[PDB]
Design a protein around this nucleic acid. Structure first.
Lengths: 215, 229
RNA sequence: GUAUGCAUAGGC
């Protein structure tokens, strides 16, 4: 039957300079044929290790791996901001060549507050009969945050969606984008459009608002 | 100079069929073991199939077995993945990769996949191709100012956005697209710039949605509030 | 546990 590679932990967070160990266990004997890959978000995986211990050309010295029995370990000696990625093992012993489910490595850094911006709908969009209002939370940490829309003090729920970027591989920060969508009709029936941001680097919540028909 | 390039991805209806191409340069496919690996949205990697063109040996993962076969064309130095009876779960990015066929690959363990393609997205859906609209996000914090494009109501993925034809890179964030209740995608691309530069420098959103052949250059500038002129 | 190059390819 098919060989299973059980990789742990599912995810981990560790600071710069730390040693990190990701482990992988084969459900059967893979006899040392194991590779490790690094995958940056939206990008092709890159080969790190190819036998259980061997370093592929061009791969930094901080990456190593070793085998005892069916247990396999990948080791990053000093974590770098560029090391943010998902890390996968794979066995080449017997087809199908199975991957472990992966380990996403977040890099800890010092707390940073989101810079908040708010964007009123374009005139162009309005004539389509829709209004989109975008609240931008730029370059913050940790990833948890909260955005709340208020239209004339009425809290908006179920009409927005948000999206977060992957951890930056230099400053290790995050960025968030939230969009409130309304019919034009409902848009032009109100005045104050605001977004309130809750995060740790903020001693008190920040609000960024506009008034419809203002400039 | 060794490279692999995927082609043939795109929108396909359930039960339909698709043919992906993996085109090799800087080596002959006969010298390598060519694999296909796929990743469903927010999912791990899944090994699906491989061909070794010299022998002609192949294997298929159960998930794709009997619906998918792989073929080698040495004349075009390309491998093809023929996918039939496609299902919604077959929706994923599809990578071709290789390992070189070396003494070590055979007698020893060097099988790790050294060269990968960039990937190609395969969306299995009944829904219809639709192009985006592009709307400005106009700047009005500190010594910096933020502006961007809102790329709204398109399908399927992907959409690519660059700034000033790719001249402007630092400062940029393009956010993961979101699926709305309509069934269409929306994303925003934002750039923070020195507020000093709003007069001087031009900012242009370059939007490309390949499925619908829609390309848009959107110039973003702060809005002007007079009205007395 | 070493050559992600070659090669009737189980050898160099």
């Amino acid at each position: 039957s098919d060989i299973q590679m059980t990789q742990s932990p599912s995810s981990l967070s560790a600071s710069v300079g730390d040693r990190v160990t990701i482990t992988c266990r084969a459900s059967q004997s893979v006899s040392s044929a194991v590779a490790w890959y690094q995958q940056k978000p939206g990008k092709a995986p890159k080969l790190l290790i190819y036998s259980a211990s061997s370093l592929y050309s061009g791969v930094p010295s901080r990456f190593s791996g070793s085998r005892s029995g069916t247990d396999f370990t990948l080791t990053i000696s000093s974590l770098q901001p560029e090391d943010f990625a998902t890390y996968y093992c794979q066995q080449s012993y017997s087809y199908p060549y199975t991957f472990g489910q992966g380990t996403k490595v977040e890099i800890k850094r010092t707390v940073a507050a989101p810079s908040v911006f708010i964007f009123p709908p374009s005139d162009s969009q309005l004539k389509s009969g829709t209004a989109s209002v975008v609240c931008l939370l730029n370059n913050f940490y940790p990833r948890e945050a909260k955005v709340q829309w208020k239209v004339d003090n009425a809290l908006q729920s179920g009409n927005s969606q948000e999206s977060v970027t992957e951890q930056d591989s230099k400053d290790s920060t995050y960025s968030l984008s939230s969009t409130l969508t309304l019919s034009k009709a409902d848009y032009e029936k109100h005045k104050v459009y605001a977004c309130e941001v809750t995060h740790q680097g903020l001693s008190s919540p920040v609000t960024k608002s506009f008034n419809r028909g203002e400039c | 100079e060794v490279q692999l390039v995927e082609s043939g991805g795109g929108l396909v209806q359930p039960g339909g069929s698709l043919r992906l191409s993996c085109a090799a340069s800087g080596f002959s496919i006969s010298s390598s073991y060519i694999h296909w690996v796929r990743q469903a949205p927010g999912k791990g990697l899944e090994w699906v199939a491989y061909i070794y063109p010299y022998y002609g040996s192949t294997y298929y993962a159960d998930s794709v077995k009997g619906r998918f076969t792989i073929s080698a064309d040495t004349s075009k130095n390309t491998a093809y993945l023929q996918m039939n009876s496609l299902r919604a779960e077959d929706t994923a990015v599809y990578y071709c990769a290789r390992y070189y066929s070396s003494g070590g690959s055979y007698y020893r363990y060097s099988r790790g996949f050294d060269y990968w393609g960039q990937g190609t997205l395969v969306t299995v859906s009944s829904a219809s191709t639709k192009g985006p609209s592009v709307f400005p996000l106009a700047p009005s914090s500190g010594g910096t100012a933020a502006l961007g494009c809102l790329v709204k109501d398109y399908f399927p993925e992907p959409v690519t956005v660059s700034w000033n034809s790719g001249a402007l890179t630092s400062g940029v964030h393009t956010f993961p697209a979101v699926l709305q209740s309509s069934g269409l995608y929306s994303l925003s691309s934002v750039v923070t710039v020195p507020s000093s530069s709003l007069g001087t420098q031009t900012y242009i959103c370059n939007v490309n949605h390949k499925p619908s052949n829609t390309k848009v250059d959107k110039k973003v500038e702060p809005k002007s509030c007079d009205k007395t002129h």
